[PDB]
Amino acid sequence: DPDQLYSTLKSILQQVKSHQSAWPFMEPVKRTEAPGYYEVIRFPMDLKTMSERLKNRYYVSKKLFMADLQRVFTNCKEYNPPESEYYKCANILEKFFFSKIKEAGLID
Ligand SMILES: NC(=O)c1cccc2c1OCCO2
């Protein structure tokens, strides 16, 4: 079911967005926030871009959704020091994300 997958991913994405550790990932990283970010991170991703992708019916599979959200975390951990707040946020939100995927029974 297409609309089943859509509904589930939308619920999950909205919960991830409302979480208090999501704030670093809500929109594209701004050049002024991180000058030369876009020279280091070749595949940028953020939750706004994911919202649009979802609305645009891009997430036809679990795999695609997971790949994008994971990219958000791996960009963060590649760019930032391990004890930075942004790195801490990524691991907290990743935990939350996995509980939500499991809670949904969302399998591939
Ligand atoms: N998310 C990041 O890795 C990030 C890295 C550097 C600056 C930032 C960032 O997120 C939005 C706020 O400004």
Both tokens assigned to 43: 């595949």
Q: Is the CB of 86 under 6 A from ligand 1?
A: yes
DSSP SS3 for 84: coil
Query: What are the φ/ψ torsions at residue 56 (nearest 5 degrees)?
Result: -80, 5
97's CB contacts (< 8 A; 6+ apart) are 12, 16, 69
DSSP secondary structure, 13-66, as one string: HHHHHHSTT-GGGSSPPPTTTSTTHHHH-SS---HHHHHHHHHTT---SHHHHH
Report the structure determination method: X-ray
Q: How many domains is the chain built from?
A: 1
Q: Is the CB of 29 under 6 A from ligand 1?
A: yes
Q: Is the CB of 74 under 6 A from ligand 1?
A: no
The resolution in Å comes to: 2.2
Q: Which of 22, 32, 40, 8 has the alpha carbon at shortest distance from 89?
A: 22
The Cα-based distances of 50 to 45, 74, 83 in angstroms read 8, 15, 26
Q: Which of 27, 106, 15 has the alpha carbon at shortest distance from 64?
A: 106
Q: How far apart are CA 15 and CA 31, in angstroms?
A: 27
First and final CA of the chain: distance in angstroms?
13
Q: In terms of C-beta density within 10 A (0-12 exposed, 13-18 middle, 19 or more buried), how is residue 45 classed? A: buried
Cα-based torsion angle of the residue sequence 57, 63, 67, 73 in order, rounded to the nearest 10 degrees: 110
Whichever domain contains 15, its CATH number is 1.20.920.10
The Cα-based distances of 65 to 5, 14, 33, 106, 107 in angstroms read 10, 13, 26, 11, 12
Q: Is the CB of 80 under 6 A from ligand 1?
A: yes
The range of the structural domain enclosing residue 68 comes to 1-108
DSSP SS3 for 101: helix
CA 6 to chain centre: 16
Residue nearest to atom 1 of ligand 1 (CA): 24
